[PDB]
């Protein structure tokens, strides 16, 4: 569900640029580290805003939750679900430096007003063939501002030449295969034996 | 045991000041609806003025179930009414009952930007002519649909001042700008709160108080170039506006190299007040 | 489900502003009573609850012009008299509605601490207050 | 007596928003009053939970219609102590 | 140590420079989410428990 | 509004220079009195304010030629006598006017500490003073 | 005494007809487990869209159901009463069930743009 | 609850349903351990936890 | 099974209030009469019960505005007359009902001791009374 | 309701000053007369009130330049004559008004004790007096 | 409750005082008054 | 550790070098913001409170 | 901080990646160093010291 959540998020920002009548600003999903790589990918990145994934973590408070199902007089056993947090970047790469600072204000203004995204909230195209696996979702967006030591770590793995950027933290993508390991019947007879010891 | 109540608006008062609401030369009173709303969004009367009831007023309001609410541009009083209706006060009101509210200032620069000669005088507003020991003229608190600003017509001195302060039973520490007194029945039907049978009026009374701003001549001082210049006409002091001065013709004795200079607008922190012109000194 | 975060909250304390920077000290604790008689085949003690205790609450916020609320509450101490207030602290969701509420009775301040003044750094001024109280009830429904 | 105090507690909200933040504050004010009366011996019950209850809010005391009209509904119950009036003394001879 | 962090993300070759800190840009869309009416009627019910 | 910063300030202490490096110790504190009788249905205590306390104030600045002010104030101690002074500490805005003022009565110094001498580093000399006093009032209006 | 009851369910061993009973005439458990059902319906409403910055309001022509997880797509001018001049650039979200106006005739859900 | 204890009747729940179960005589499938009578009954109460029930129902 | 604690109790003494901070002296005692005659094979004495004794009872509590009861009871003494009272002391359960009761016959005030005063002392003013009586019965059923 | 504290008080003793650091000995006491006759079914005694007693009162304060009052009162003793005074002791409220008053009849100085001296002792010189009297009445209305 | 002191623009001073070079200080004090006449009323006790 | 920070912002290839610390360059525009006159009249008012 | 260490030894330009930890590969040559016979006779000698 990593690609489908980020594809949905890309469409919501592009819809907000349309309502403001800005026909030059578009967000693209690619990776920031290849902006000046000069091998076949950099021509797609020019004069655009780029959204990328920089880190993955695991939610600890939900790690030991069980996932068994009881129905009738029968139990099916399943493995516990995996829950993942993301860390994202919006990197502005416009031709003019003044135009990049205007697009970063719009992205900061958009998430100030709307922070919760559900299957009923969003306006992505449900009929599209690449989106046939998505059913129900809910995630929040939260602004993240790093210190000077943390910026050196982040841009140290992306080249060493920064760009105007904002950082966000995404909550709870659920990953689960939902496969069955076993089936058994429940307890229906109890026998007790006593002896004098 | 069931208990019920119902409350309705009783009286509204509009509190305005040009220093915060005007934009340079543009007068708030002449703004259209969008312009008016825009200016109001940045205004809060509590930034400079404090308003509260006297001890007797508080006691009465408790007895008659009258409440005091406030908003960034106004004060609204509300009253308990009989269940099942809109206009019958729970408790009977009488014509000569009244409420007294006191005004005091928190903004130390009020006197620099407000165009009103308050030296040694009491500011007084009401909807009914007072009985004072010395001859005086009187005008009521203005209604919402009337023009004008607070002026000398509302100031009292000497014995008349002494009398009003005593009747209001004010604290020895003083520090009072003025007194507002509203009677249930005033000098004319349009200033009253209730009808002849005690019924609340069917159009909420809506009164207004509006203060004007001071104007001055701007003087520009350039010590390094050793030159001084003044503007030809007075300009208003405002909090948020901006006046652009960019012609040689705007000034008296403009500098040789006028084209390279920038002329900032003055603040209201320091000002010279004289019987004729007021002056604001700006350093370059 | 989804766990709650702890950066969106409000405090109703009888002042004008409800925005703070940190809250701590919301605890409950009971003392213990122990007993053993000499004929018991276990060589350890049995345990009971006894008397109860509450800890002090600390509140922190920034310093602003024309807001002397901390000192105005502390100035109501006259010998054994003080103005006691009710205190309501809520954790909020994304549409700013309460989820977990802490309800405090009979609070009054005992320590007011101002900022320290330093020349070299770039730092804002923080003021802090410590409160004594007589009970706490947690509501999460 | 109890009504005078409770009334003052709810009058503070005459022109306030009718929402969850208000409902929580109203309830907390009323319960603190009643707890103190219980502590002083006015009310019956081993713990406050047995002496009184207070209910305020959408789904408890209010519906959509009340939100629309602008009503706030508060429900309160109290365990109040009753006196003895008649003392009967029965006498007899002791058997032995 | 801080200069090494700053110029580490700008190339690694410094220039004569001064640094400044700007205070309080306000960002706000100022959009409306909801509208409701205030409290105007209060009802209290008492029972003997 | 806009929060205040803590690097621009001044101290009026009866000396020639008003520029310092740091100030600390501006606190107010009240002791607590507790009570319970045996018939109470709550098993915790009720709380009252009692006697009040003030803490010592520390001031620090740099060492300059021909300025022995710290030692001149400390040298006025003669058995139980000292020169007691009023102390006024202000936090300033951008046009150098007071915003928050701490007003101290009956101050006298009890500890004067000189710099330490080290050969290897590059450091300036700092002197420090600790003051006892009998009351503090905060004014922010 | 604290009330707070929505309703009461009462089941008798022997009901008003054999198909609602739990046991047979001789006390034997039935050979087909009794299986009863309770099902609650959902409310419908007219959706109203409010655009303050453009100063325009519009409403749908017919009521739609409130659901927790579904989605209704509104994308034709013909779906609305007095649709906006630049309809093609707008997106119309589905309403929540947190606030609703209930009247003797229609129910309404207000959505801000 | 008192009756259910006496007659050995248990209450179980699932995400979409409630099932009651009863102790029976050893060796069979359909004879209740304790004799049941026609007019015995069980009463269950319903209450709500969701504050928005009334808006959507 | 667990033992009872000793902090929840009440005292009925014919006064307005039943709360106290301390109760002590609920003792019973008898004398011993010893005997030996010269021909006994044992060189120890035989013992039997003598006359009965009781200890005085001490009650303590804090002082309150307008509560002058300890002094008013004491002041009923007139040469050889005094107002005598039945004193009932009870240890309570969680329902605030009696569990263990001490019944005391004919009590009267021997001594009343007032609060000491200290310029630097932070504490509650405590008063105390010592009572004489003619008998104690203990009930625990 | 809260109890009274014990640190704010004043003493009127016919001297220039009313401040003290310590006051003690405000006690009341009576004797007990016991009786039993041989035929009584009980083996305990019956008790009734005897004669009255009072304790001496101790007052302490610091010493001051030119205040020689304790010595001047003591020095009024001449064989069997002495200047007797009415002593009034009062516990004060927040308005500095009396709440609880102890009224003492005919006091006179039994003993005056001066300050001890120590080469290495850092402290206040304290002096004390012990007074005889003929009766105590307690008022709390 | 014993005293007050007021000094400053907007409290005791105006723009005109700043111009002239004046400083205005306002002070109030609560001062204690003596008793002069003590009247003793006597009567018989009723009983 | 400090040499690694310094040459990290100058290229990463050191040269024979010495380091010095200079004290007190004074920077001041020396411009006037305001002019006023000093206190020459004092008035005191007393009241019985 | 750990991602900076890992990609610092792989080039300095990251790619979308996941990390895993594998447990217990057993490495053993299973060669013989020596062979001996076990204890079958015990003798004890005592003396008076």
Author numbering:
A (entry chain 0A): 1 to 197
B (entry chain 1B): 1 to 284
C (entry chain 1a), F (entry chain 1b), I (entry chain 2a), J (entry chain 2b): 2 to 142
D (entry chain 2B): 595 to 690
E (entry chain 0F), L (entry chain 0E), M (entry chain 0B): 149 to 197
G (entry chain 1A): 172 to 284
H (entry chain 1A): 58 to 114
K (entry chain 2C): 644 to 690
Paper text:
CISs are macromolecular injection devices with an overall structure that is homologous to the contractile tails of bacteriophages. Their conserved modules include an inner tube, a contractile sheath and a baseplate complex. For firing of the extended apparatus, the baseplate undergoes a conformational change and triggers sheath contraction, which in turn causes the inner tube to be expelled and injected into a target. Here we performed structural and mechanistic studies on a clade Ib CIS gene cluster in the marine bacterium Algoriphagus machipongonensis PR1.
The distal AlgoCIS end is terminated by a hexameric cap complex of Alg16A, and – in contrast to other known eCISs – a hexameric complex of Alg16B, hereafter referred to as the ‘cap adaptor’. The dome-shaped Alg16A cap complex covers the inner tube, and it exhibits an ~11-Å-wide central channel. Each Alg16A subunit interacts with three Alg1 proteins from the distal inner tube layer (Alg1-L22) and terminates the tube. Compared with homologues in PVC/AFP, Alg16A is much shorter (197 amino acids in Alg16A, 293 in Pvc16, 295 in Afp16) and folds into a single domain with a C-terminal extension. Interestingly, the cap adaptor Alg16B mediates the interactions between the cap complex Alg16A and the most distal sheath layer (Alg2-L23). The cap adaptor expands the outer diameter of the cap to ~164 Å, with an enlarged inner diameter of ~115 Å. The Alg16B NTD (residues 1–213) is an immunoglobulin-like domain flanked by three additional α-helices (α1–3), whereas one single β-barrel constitutes a C-terminal domain (CTD) (residues 214–284). The Alg16B adopts a parallel arrangement with Alg16A. The N terminus of Alg16B interacts with the C terminus of Alg16A in a mimicked ‘handshake’ manner, terminating the sheath assembly. Moreover, the tube lumen was empty for all observed particles in AlgoCIS ΔAlg16B. Together, these results showed that the cap adaptor plays an important role in stabilizing the cap module and the most distal sheath layer, and its absence results in mis-assembled particles.
